[PDB]
């Protein structure tokens, strides 16, 4: 099976809503030890964003029921509820380490230093999925992934203000998810509102240099900004 038939298989599983095959077909494209294009980068991105996102939505549903049963004291019903929560967690982690392993070894490592768009992309991916593990982590294991998400987001932010204009939807995308990491994970609203406000104002002046993506990400920014205010 050649590289373009795999890319064909990935875009077929997308319309078929089979994002597990779409993930494996793009994992097979990455492991050919060759760069990924814009469309193939997003193919991998959308694939794993849906796979882990299914588990996130499921986990948050079981977590809510677990808190209701904890309040009621039904300790016979809760051990089935909680056993199911761990199952989805372990599934959620297996996807994330699978994504992270394909970034440190293939995608971040292969980038040339003058390729700044792909690095910030893959570094925002690194921050995103480390944040996704920190959503369900607890105690000792949590402090590790929160640091890793910080390390990936901080480096990618420093690269992004250097060689990316304010209206770039990738530069704007990390600034959004970084402030989400500051508020939802680290519990720092002032650092989260400062990062979100700065990104929105930097892009409001360079707006005619930009469009459907950036304005939407900026719409999510001020939406997050209002919710935190």
């Amino acid at each position: 099976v050649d590289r373009e038939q795999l890319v064909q298989k990935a875009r077929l599983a997308e319309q078929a809503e089979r994002y597990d095959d779409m993930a494996a077909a793009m994992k097979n494209v990455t492991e050919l030890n060759e760069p990924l294009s814009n469309e193939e980068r997003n193919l991998l991105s959308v694939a794993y964003k849906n796979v882990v996102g299914a588990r996130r939505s499921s986990w948050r549903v079981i977590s809510s029921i677990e808190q209701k049963t904890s309040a009621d004291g039904n300790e016979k019903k809760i051990e089935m509820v909680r056993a199911y929560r761990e199952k989805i967690e372990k599934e959620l982690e297996a996807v994330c380490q699978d994504v992270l392993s394909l970034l440190d070894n293939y995608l971040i490592k292969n980038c040339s230093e003058t390729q700044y768009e792909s690095k910030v992309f893959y570094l925002k991916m690194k921050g995103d999925y480390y944040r996704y593990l920190a959503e369900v982590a607890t105690g000792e294991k949590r402090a590790t992934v929160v640091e890793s998400s910080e390390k990936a987001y901080s480096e990618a932010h420093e690269i992004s203000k250097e060689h990316m204009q304010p209206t770039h939807p990738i530069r704007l995308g990390l600034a959004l998810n970084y402030s989400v990491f500051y508020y939802e994970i680290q519990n720092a609203p002032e650092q989260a509102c400062h990062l979100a406000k700065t990104a929105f104002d930097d892009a409001i002046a360079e707006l005619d240099t930009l469009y459907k993506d950036s304005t939407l990400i900026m719409q999510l920014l001020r939406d997050n900004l209002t919710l935190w205010t």
Binding site: L174, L176, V180
Partner: peptide, 6 residues
Amino acid sequence: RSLSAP
């Protein structure tokens, strides 16, 4: 929850 990037 908050809103992240797609």
